[PDB]
Design a protein around this ligand. Structure first.
Ligand code: HEM
Ligand code: HEM
Lengths: 145, 145
Protein backbone atom coordinates (compact mmCIF):
# COMPACT_ATOMS: atom_id res chain seq x y z
CA UNK A 1 0.00 0.00 0.00
CA UNK A 2 1.42 3.35 -1.08
CA UNK A 3 -0.41 4.94 1.85
CA UNK A 4 1.18 2.60 4.40
CA UNK A 5 4.56 3.21 2.76
CA UNK A 6 4.09 6.97 2.96
CA UNK A 7 3.34 6.59 6.68
CA UNK A 8 6.88 5.22 7.10
CA UNK A 9 8.22 8.72 6.49
CA UNK A 10 8.56 9.75 10.13
CA UNK A 11 9.85 13.09 11.43
CA UNK A 12 13.42 11.79 11.61
CA UNK A 13 13.30 10.35 8.09
CA UNK A 14 11.86 13.54 6.62
CA UNK A 15 14.59 15.57 8.33
CA UNK A 16 17.36 13.37 6.93
CA UNK A 17 15.84 13.59 3.45
CA UNK A 18 15.66 17.39 3.60
CA UNK A 19 19.13 17.84 5.07
CA UNK A 20 20.83 15.66 2.47
CA UNK A 21 18.75 17.10 -0.36
CA UNK A 22 19.94 20.62 0.45
CA UNK A 23 23.39 19.43 -0.63
CA UNK A 24 22.62 16.91 -3.38
CA UNK A 25 19.90 19.04 -4.95
CA UNK A 26 22.26 22.03 -5.28
CA UNK A 27 23.81 20.43 -8.37
CA UNK A 28 21.03 18.68 -10.23
CA UNK A 29 22.94 18.33 -13.49
CA UNK A 30 26.11 16.96 -11.92
CA UNK A 31 24.52 14.61 -9.40
CA UNK A 32 21.70 13.60 -11.72
CA UNK A 33 24.11 12.40 -14.39
CA UNK A 34 26.29 10.79 -11.71
CA UNK A 35 23.27 8.85 -10.47
CA UNK A 36 22.41 7.59 -13.96
CA UNK A 37 25.96 6.70 -15.00
CA UNK A 38 26.35 4.76 -11.75
CA UNK A 39 23.12 2.87 -12.42
CA UNK A 40 24.35 1.90 -15.89
CA UNK A 41 27.80 0.89 -14.65
CA UNK A 42 26.58 -1.21 -11.71
CA UNK A 43 23.49 -2.68 -13.37
CA UNK A 44 24.31 -3.07 -17.06
CA UNK A 45 21.16 -5.14 -17.55
CA UNK A 46 19.01 -2.00 -17.24
CA UNK A 47 20.62 -0.10 -20.13
CA UNK A 48 18.23 -1.70 -22.61
CA UNK A 49 15.27 0.18 -21.13
CA UNK A 50 16.95 3.47 -22.01
CA UNK A 51 17.29 3.01 -25.78
CA UNK A 52 15.78 6.44 -26.47
CA UNK A 53 18.74 8.17 -24.82
CA UNK A 54 21.24 6.69 -27.27
CA UNK A 55 24.80 5.93 -26.15
CA UNK A 56 24.60 6.41 -22.39
CA UNK A 57 28.33 5.73 -22.00
CA UNK A 58 28.93 9.29 -23.25
CA UNK A 59 27.59 10.59 -19.94
CA UNK A 60 27.48 14.38 -19.68
CA UNK A 61 28.29 14.69 -23.40
CA UNK A 62 24.98 13.01 -24.32
CA UNK A 63 22.34 15.76 -24.56
CA UNK A 64 19.40 13.38 -24.17
CA UNK A 65 20.96 11.80 -21.09
CA UNK A 66 21.64 15.24 -19.60
CA UNK A 67 18.08 16.41 -20.20
CA UNK A 68 16.72 13.20 -18.73
CA UNK A 69 19.01 13.38 -15.71
CA UNK A 70 18.21 16.98 -14.84
CA UNK A 71 14.48 16.24 -15.13
CA UNK A 72 14.82 13.21 -12.86
CA UNK A 73 16.25 15.47 -10.15
CA UNK A 74 13.17 17.67 -10.38
CA UNK A 75 11.00 14.62 -9.70
CA UNK A 76 12.97 14.15 -6.48
CA UNK A 77 12.61 17.88 -5.72
CA UNK A 78 8.86 17.40 -6.21
CA UNK A 79 8.79 14.51 -3.71
CA UNK A 80 10.75 16.48 -1.09
CA UNK A 81 8.42 19.45 -1.44
CA UNK A 82 5.37 17.23 -0.85
CA UNK A 83 6.62 15.62 2.37
CA UNK A 84 4.34 17.82 4.51
CA UNK A 85 1.16 16.53 2.85
CA UNK A 86 0.84 12.74 2.40
CA UNK A 87 -2.14 13.05 0.04
CA UNK A 88 -0.12 15.24 -2.32
CA UNK A 89 2.99 13.08 -2.05
CA UNK A 90 0.92 10.06 -3.00
CA UNK A 91 -0.65 11.65 -6.08
CA UNK A 92 2.72 12.78 -7.49
CA UNK A 93 4.30 9.41 -6.72
CA UNK A 94 1.46 7.68 -8.56
CA UNK A 95 1.99 10.00 -11.54
CA UNK A 96 5.64 8.98 -11.83
CA UNK A 97 4.80 5.34 -11.15
CA UNK A 98 2.66 5.36 -14.30
CA UNK A 99 5.64 6.67 -16.30
CA UNK A 100 7.52 3.55 -15.22
CA UNK A 101 4.69 1.02 -15.40
CA UNK A 102 4.32 1.92 -19.08
CA UNK A 103 8.03 1.14 -19.50
CA UNK A 104 7.53 -2.28 -17.89
CA UNK A 105 9.61 -1.42 -14.81
CA UNK A 106 8.80 -3.58 -11.76
CA UNK A 107 9.15 -2.63 -8.11
CA UNK A 108 12.20 -4.88 -7.86
CA UNK A 109 13.98 -3.26 -10.79
CA UNK A 110 13.08 0.25 -9.66
CA UNK A 111 14.76 -0.67 -6.38
CA UNK A 112 18.06 -1.08 -8.20
CA UNK A 113 18.40 2.70 -7.86
CA UNK A 114 19.19 2.27 -4.14
CA UNK A 115 22.75 1.16 -4.84
CA UNK A 116 23.54 4.25 -6.95
CA UNK A 117 21.85 6.57 -4.44
CA UNK A 118 24.00 5.19 -1.62
CA UNK A 119 27.14 5.71 -3.71
CA UNK A 120 26.29 9.27 -4.74
CA UNK A 121 25.42 10.13 -1.14
CA UNK A 122 28.65 8.56 0.14
CA UNK A 123 30.70 10.65 -2.27
CA UNK A 124 29.25 13.73 -0.53
CA UNK A 125 29.97 12.34 2.94
CA UNK A 126 26.42 11.17 3.67
CA UNK A 127 26.48 7.64 5.08
CA UNK A 128 24.16 4.68 5.56
CA UNK A 129 21.82 6.72 7.77
CA UNK A 130 20.92 8.89 4.78
CA UNK A 131 20.95 6.04 2.28
CA UNK A 132 18.35 4.24 4.40
CA UNK A 133 16.17 7.36 4.58
CA UNK A 134 16.22 7.64 0.80
CA UNK A 135 15.40 3.94 0.50
CA UNK A 136 12.20 4.60 2.44
CA UNK A 137 11.19 7.27 -0.06
CA UNK A 138 12.03 4.97 -2.98
CA UNK A 139 9.84 2.38 -1.24
CA UNK A 140 6.81 4.65 -1.62
CA UNK A 141 7.28 4.56 -5.39
CA UNK A 142 7.83 0.81 -5.30
CA UNK A 143 4.48 0.37 -3.53
CA UNK A 144 2.81 1.97 -6.55
CA UNK A 145 4.43 -0.18 -9.23
CA UNK B 1 16.40 26.14 -34.15
CA UNK B 2 15.47 25.60 -30.51
CA UNK B 3 18.89 26.94 -29.51
CA UNK B 4 18.17 30.10 -31.53
CA UNK B 5 14.83 30.61 -29.78
CA UNK B 6 16.47 30.09 -26.38
CA UNK B 7 19.59 32.18 -26.99
CA UNK B 8 17.26 35.05 -27.90
CA UNK B 9 15.71 35.30 -24.41
CA UNK B 10 17.10 38.64 -23.21
CA UNK B 11 18.13 39.82 -19.75
CA UNK B 12 14.90 41.79 -19.41
CA UNK B 13 12.73 38.84 -20.45
CA UNK B 14 14.54 36.55 -18.02
CA UNK B 15 14.04 39.11 -15.25
CA UNK B 16 10.30 39.25 -15.90
CA UNK B 17 10.06 35.46 -16.03
CA UNK B 18 11.90 35.10 -12.73
CA UNK B 19 9.98 37.85 -10.95
CA UNK B 20 6.60 36.43 -11.92
CA UNK B 21 7.68 32.86 -11.18
CA UNK B 22 8.74 33.85 -7.65
CA UNK B 23 5.04 34.41 -7.02
CA UNK B 24 3.25 31.93 -9.29
CA UNK B 25 5.73 29.17 -8.54
CA UNK B 26 5.27 29.62 -4.79
CA UNK B 27 1.91 27.82 -4.95
CA UNK B 28 2.44 25.03 -7.45
CA UNK B 29 -0.64 23.00 -6.48
CA UNK B 30 -3.03 25.95 -6.51
CA UNK B 31 -1.71 27.67 -9.62
CA UNK B 32 -1.00 24.45 -11.47
CA UNK B 33 -4.59 23.25 -11.11
CA UNK B 34 -5.87 26.72 -11.98
CA UNK B 35 -3.81 26.66 -15.18
CA UNK B 36 -5.22 23.28 -16.21
CA UNK B 37 -8.83 24.07 -15.29
CA UNK B 38 -8.62 27.32 -17.26
CA UNK B 39 -7.28 25.43 -20.28
CA UNK B 40 -10.25 23.04 -20.12
CA UNK B 41 -12.76 25.85 -19.63
CA UNK B 42 -11.58 27.99 -22.55
CA UNK B 43 -10.41 25.21 -24.87
CA UNK B 44 -12.88 22.38 -24.37
CA UNK B 45 -11.56 20.64 -27.50
CA UNK B 46 -8.43 19.67 -25.54
CA UNK B 47 -10.28 17.71 -22.85
CA UNK B 48 -10.13 14.46 -24.84
CA UNK B 49 -6.32 14.45 -24.82
CA UNK B 50 -6.36 14.09 -21.04
CA UNK B 51 -8.51 10.98 -20.77
CA UNK B 52 -5.97 9.34 -18.44
CA UNK B 53 -6.76 11.93 -15.77
CA UNK B 54 -10.41 10.93 -15.55
CA UNK B 55 -13.07 13.56 -14.87
CA UNK B 56 -11.15 16.83 -15.01
CA UNK B 57 -14.23 18.78 -13.92
CA UNK B 58 -13.55 17.50 -10.39
CA UNK B 59 -10.64 19.91 -10.11
CA UNK B 60 -8.53 19.72 -6.95
CA UNK B 61 -10.46 16.65 -5.77
CA UNK B 62 -9.21 14.64 -8.75
CA UNK B 63 -5.95 13.11 -7.51
CA UNK B 64 -4.69 12.33 -11.01
CA UNK B 65 -5.30 15.90 -12.15
CA UNK B 66 -3.64 17.24 -9.01
CA UNK B 67 -0.58 15.03 -9.50
CA UNK B 68 -0.33 16.06 -13.14
CA UNK B 69 -0.74 19.76 -12.35
CA UNK B 70 1.90 19.83 -9.63
CA UNK B 71 4.33 17.98 -11.89
CA UNK B 72 3.67 20.41 -14.75
CA UNK B 73 4.77 23.25 -12.47
CA UNK B 74 8.09 21.50 -11.86
CA UNK B 75 8.68 21.34 -15.62
CA UNK B 76 8.28 25.13 -15.52
CA UNK B 77 10.58 25.32 -12.50
CA UNK B 78 13.12 23.32 -14.51
CA UNK B 79 12.94 25.79 -17.41
CA UNK B 80 13.28 28.83 -15.17
CA UNK B 81 16.31 27.33 -13.44
CA UNK B 82 18.06 26.71 -16.79
CA UNK B 83 17.54 30.22 -18.21
CA UNK B 84 21.18 31.29 -17.95
CA UNK B 85 22.54 28.24 -19.78
CA UNK B 86 20.90 27.83 -23.22
CA UNK B 87 22.58 24.45 -23.69
CA UNK B 88 20.86 23.09 -20.59
CA UNK B 89 17.57 24.82 -21.38
CA UNK B 90 17.56 23.26 -24.84
CA UNK B 91 18.11 19.70 -23.64
CA UNK B 92 15.32 19.90 -21.05
CA UNK B 93 12.96 21.56 -23.54
CA UNK B 94 13.62 18.80 -26.08
CA UNK B 95 12.91 16.20 -23.40
CA UNK B 96 9.48 17.67 -22.67
CA UNK B 97 8.84 18.20 -26.38
CA UNK B 98 9.12 14.44 -26.87
CA UNK B 99 6.48 13.92 -24.17
CA UNK B 100 4.10 15.98 -26.28
CA UNK B 101 5.18 14.80 -29.73
CA UNK B 102 4.27 11.26 -28.68
CA UNK B 103 0.76 12.54 -27.89
CA UNK B 104 0.48 14.23 -31.29
CA UNK B 105 0.43 17.74 -29.83
CA UNK B 106 1.34 20.28 -32.52
CA UNK B 107 3.21 23.54 -32.02
CA UNK B 108 -0.04 25.43 -32.62
CA UNK B 109 -1.93 23.33 -30.06
CA UNK B 110 0.83 23.75 -27.50
CA UNK B 111 0.46 27.50 -27.93
CA UNK B 112 -3.10 27.26 -26.59
CA UNK B 113 -1.56 27.41 -23.12
CA UNK B 114 -0.79 31.12 -23.59
CA UNK B 115 -4.39 32.11 -22.89
CA UNK B 116 -4.50 30.31 -19.52
CA UNK B 117 -1.04 31.63 -18.63
CA UNK B 118 -2.16 35.20 -19.28
CA UNK B 119 -5.20 34.71 -17.03
CA UNK B 120 -3.31 33.06 -14.17
CA UNK B 121 -0.69 35.82 -14.30
CA UNK B 122 -3.45 38.43 -14.23
CA UNK B 123 -4.90 36.86 -11.08
CA UNK B 124 -1.69 37.93 -9.34
CA UNK B 125 -1.62 41.30 -11.10
CA UNK B 126 1.12 40.49 -13.62
CA UNK B 127 0.17 42.29 -16.83
CA UNK B 128 0.72 41.99 -20.57
CA UNK B 129 4.48 42.52 -20.33
CA UNK B 130 4.73 39.35 -18.24
CA UNK B 131 2.34 37.42 -20.48
CA UNK B 132 4.54 38.38 -23.43
CA UNK B 133 7.64 37.15 -21.58
CA UNK B 134 6.02 33.78 -20.93
CA UNK B 135 4.86 33.52 -24.53
CA UNK B 136 8.52 33.80 -25.54
CA UNK B 137 9.42 30.88 -23.27
CA UNK B 138 6.52 28.82 -24.66
CA UNK B 139 7.87 29.67 -28.12
CA UNK B 140 11.11 27.90 -27.25
CA UNK B 141 9.18 24.67 -26.79
CA UNK B 142 7.18 25.36 -29.93
CA UNK B 143 10.48 25.48 -31.84
CA UNK B 144 10.91 21.83 -30.87
CA UNK B 145 7.44 20.74 -32.01
C1 HEM C 1 14.90 7.71 -7.83
C2 HEM C 1 14.30 6.88 -8.84
C3 HEM C 1 13.82 7.30 -10.09
C4 HEM C 1 13.13 8.44 -10.42
C5 HEM C 1 12.69 9.56 -9.48
C6 HEM C 1 12.80 8.36 -11.83
C7 HEM C 1 12.21 9.41 -12.57
C8 HEM C 1 11.99 9.36 -13.95
C9 HEM C 1 11.45 10.44 -14.74
C10 HEM C 1 11.05 11.82 -14.24
C11 HEM C 1 11.35 9.99 -16.02
C12 HEM C 1 10.71 10.71 -17.20
C13 HEM C 1 9.29 10.21 -17.41
C14 HEM C 1 8.77 10.51 -18.80
O1 HEM C 1 8.99 11.63 -19.29
O2 HEM C 1 8.14 9.61 -19.41
C15 HEM C 1 11.86 8.64 -16.04
C16 HEM C 1 11.95 7.86 -17.20
C17 HEM C 1 12.40 6.55 -17.23
N1 HEM C 1 12.78 5.82 -16.12
FE1 HEM C 1 13.01 6.49 -14.24
N2 HEM C 1 13.25 7.16 -12.36
C18 HEM C 1 13.89 6.51 -11.31
C19 HEM C 1 14.46 5.22 -11.38
C20 HEM C 1 14.39 4.39 -12.49
C21 HEM C 1 14.93 3.05 -12.57
C22 HEM C 1 15.70 2.37 -11.44
C23 HEM C 1 14.66 2.55 -13.82
C24 HEM C 1 15.04 1.32 -14.40
C25 HEM C 1 15.47 0.12 -13.71
C26 HEM C 1 13.91 3.58 -14.50
C27 HEM C 1 13.52 3.48 -15.83
C28 HEM C 1 13.03 4.54 -16.61
C29 HEM C 1 12.86 4.49 -18.04
C30 HEM C 1 13.07 3.27 -18.93
C31 HEM C 1 12.48 5.73 -18.43
C32 HEM C 1 12.20 6.20 -19.85
C33 HEM C 1 13.37 6.97 -20.44
C34 HEM C 1 13.06 7.53 -21.80
O3 HEM C 1 12.86 6.74 -22.75
O4 HEM C 1 13.00 8.77 -21.93
N3 HEM C 1 13.80 4.72 -13.71
N4 HEM C 1 12.23 8.26 -14.76
C1 HEM D 1 2.55 25.23 -20.10
C2 HEM D 1 2.97 24.23 -21.05
C3 HEM D 1 3.01 22.87 -20.77
C4 HEM D 1 3.81 22.12 -19.93
C5 HEM D 1 4.67 22.51 -18.71
C6 HEM D 1 3.52 20.74 -20.14
C7 HEM D 1 4.09 19.72 -19.37
C8 HEM D 1 3.64 18.43 -19.31
C9 HEM D 1 4.24 17.41 -18.50
C10 HEM D 1 5.36 17.58 -17.48
C11 HEM D 1 3.55 16.30 -18.79
C12 HEM D 1 3.82 14.89 -18.28
C13 HEM D 1 4.59 14.12 -19.34
C14 HEM D 1 4.63 12.63 -19.06
O1 HEM D 1 4.93 12.26 -17.91
O2 HEM D 1 4.37 11.83 -19.99
C15 HEM D 1 2.50 16.64 -19.71
C16 HEM D 1 1.62 15.72 -20.28
C17 HEM D 1 0.69 16.03 -21.27
N1 HEM D 1 0.54 17.26 -21.87
FE1 HEM D 1 1.48 18.97 -21.39
N2 HEM D 1 2.46 20.62 -20.99
C18 HEM D 1 2.15 21.90 -21.41
C19 HEM D 1 1.13 22.25 -22.31
C20 HEM D 1 0.27 21.33 -22.92
C21 HEM D 1 -0.79 21.66 -23.85
C22 HEM D 1 -1.13 23.07 -24.32
C23 HEM D 1 -1.37 20.49 -24.23
C24 HEM D 1 -2.46 20.23 -25.10
C25 HEM D 1 -3.15 21.15 -25.95
C26 HEM D 1 -0.66 19.44 -23.53
C27 HEM D 1 -1.00 18.08 -23.62
C28 HEM D 1 -0.45 17.07 -22.82
C29 HEM D 1 -0.97 15.73 -22.77
C30 HEM D 1 -2.12 15.16 -23.59
C31 HEM D 1 -0.28 15.09 -21.81
C32 HEM D 1 -0.50 13.65 -21.34
C33 HEM D 1 -1.31 13.59 -20.07
C34 HEM D 1 -1.38 12.18 -19.50
O3 HEM D 1 -2.07 11.33 -20.11
O4 HEM D 1 -0.74 11.93 -18.46
N3 HEM D 1 0.32 19.96 -22.72
N4 HEM D 1 2.59 17.97 -20.05
Amino acid sequence: SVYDAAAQLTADVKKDLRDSWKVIGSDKKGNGVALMTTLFADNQETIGYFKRLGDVSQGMANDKLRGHSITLMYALQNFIDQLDNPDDLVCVVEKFAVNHITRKISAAEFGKINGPIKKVLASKNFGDKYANAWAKLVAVVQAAL
